[PDB]
């Protein structure tokens, strides 16, 4: 099993991808809008991915709501987390989790890269994609994100808290290539790290971002730092689940490492499943070869975490048109609940 999630180019698995999957057996896949055109087409894609894998593959997506939604071609839209936070509706948060879980399960998706546990500390901070945050302080994020994660998992879809160690505090720094968090660790555990600690039972996994924590490790970003991942995340935060990396194929991380070297470094640092989202095939064989150079006990530890995640994955609902109709109906009413509250 290749320890990574890889992306898929289109509506069906192509010839190069299928050959690489059979040969290398990636732990799973991440889907984007380019993979999602119709219900029948998506269920066929996820069925193909499961059939090509000996293990039960992670099949993941970023179905957050608002501007991070991958199902527009199906007519399935969802309100943003921030809008449901402004609405103050507790039932609306429950329903976002319940409806997301129901719809992803009908599509054969088994993991959702949510909740975002980043804190929107000031309404003046970075808003590249606005509306992704559940609140402006740790306690509101924990309450709202915890209700969300509970009802996503109640519906059988695995959750992922992101982005460790907390993007709300990350700032540009002309002394570094990547965003930087200069906070002391003690202050971090009182604020941006607190949602990850408080929600460990509700988080199937955690995704780490390519952020510099210079007071902990000034040479490697969090995803590639043994001191951040094994020290801060595993030892002091105590998280025992699967750790994903943010995409290694786009962004400033690519100006310093190619994706194959980056993925290997993240495994060595203690991550379990690096993300190779876009044009992954050139990078996989170098990773599969380098991975035999990892500490065998660390590899065994990571494999048991991935195997535990794999055993918790759910299979798609049996075909039933009225079930999908209810997904659309409930998704639409959820958007209307929010619009009527503005
Ligand atoms: Cl292909
Ligand atoms: Cl459809
Ligand atoms: Cl919004
Ligand atoms: Cl806070
Ligand atoms: Cl844990
Ligand atoms: Mg369509
Ligand atoms: Mg399988």
TrEMBL record:
Mg(2+) 3 binds at residues 50, 55. InterPro entries: GH (IPR017853), Glyco_hydro_3_N (IPR001764), Glyco_hydro_3_N_sf (IPR036962), NagZ_Beta-hexosaminidase (IPR050226). It is an enzyme of class 3 (hydrolase). Residues 14-293 form the Glycoside hydrolase family 3 N-terminal domain. Keywords: Glycosidase, Hydrolase, Metal-binding. One of its GO terms (biological process) is carbohydrate metabolic process. Its EC number is 3.2.1.52. N-acetyl-alpha-D-glucosamine binds at residues 62, 132, 162, 246-247. Mg(2+) 1 binds at residues 37, 73. Mg(2+) 2 binds at residues 50, 53, 55. It catalyses: Hydrolysis of terminal non-reducing N-acetyl-D-hexosamine residues in N-acetyl-beta-D-hexosaminides. One of its GO terms (molecular function) is beta-N-acetylhexosaminidase activity. Belongs to the glycosyl hydrolase 3 family. This is beta-N-acetylhexosaminidase.
């Amino acid at each position: 099993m290749l320890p990574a999630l890889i992306g898929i180019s289109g509506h069906e698995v192509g010839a190069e991808e299928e050959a690489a999957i059979r040969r290398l057996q990636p732990a799973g896949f991440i889907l984007f809008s380019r993979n999602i055109d119709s219900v029948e087409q998506v269920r066929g894609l996820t069925e193909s991915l499961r059939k090509l894998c000996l293990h039960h593959p992670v099949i993941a997506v970023d179905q957050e709501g608002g501007r991070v939604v991958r199902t527009a071609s199906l007519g399935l839209n969802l309100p943003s987390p921030a809008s449901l936070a402004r609405l103050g509706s507790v039932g609306g948060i429950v329903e976002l989790g319940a409806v997301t879980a129901l719809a992803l399960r009908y599509l054969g998706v088994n993991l959702n890269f949510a909740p975002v546990l980043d804190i929107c500390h000031d309404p003046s901070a970075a808003n590249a994609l606005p509306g992704r945050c559940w609140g402006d302080n740790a306690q509101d994020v924990i309450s709202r994100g915890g209700v969300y994660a509970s009802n996503l998992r109640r519906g059988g879809v695995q959750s992922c808290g992101k982005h460790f160690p907390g993007m709300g505090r990350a700032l540009a720094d002309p002394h570094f290539s990547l965003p930087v968090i200069g906070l002391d660790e003690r202050e971090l555990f009182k604020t941006d790290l607190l949602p990850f600690l408080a929600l460990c039972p509700a988080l199937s996994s955690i995704m780490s971002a390519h952020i510099m924590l210079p007071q902990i490790d000034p040479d490697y970003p969090a995803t590639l730092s043994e001191r951040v991942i094994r020290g801060l995340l595993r030892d002091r935060l105590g998280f025992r689940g699967v750790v994903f990396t943010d995409d290694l194929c786009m962004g400033a991380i690519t100006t310093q490492y190619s994706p194959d070297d980056a993925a290997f470094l993240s495994l060595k640092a203690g991550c379990d499943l690096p993300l190779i989202c876009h044009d992954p095939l050139p990078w996989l064989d170098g990773l599969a070869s380098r991975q035999e150079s990892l500490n065998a006990y660390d590899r065994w530890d990571s494999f048991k975490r991935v195997e535990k995640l794999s055993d918790s994955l759910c299979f798609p609902f049996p075909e039933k048109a009225s079930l999908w109709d209810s997904c659309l109906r409930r998704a639409e009413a959820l958007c209307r609940l929010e619009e009527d509250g503005r």
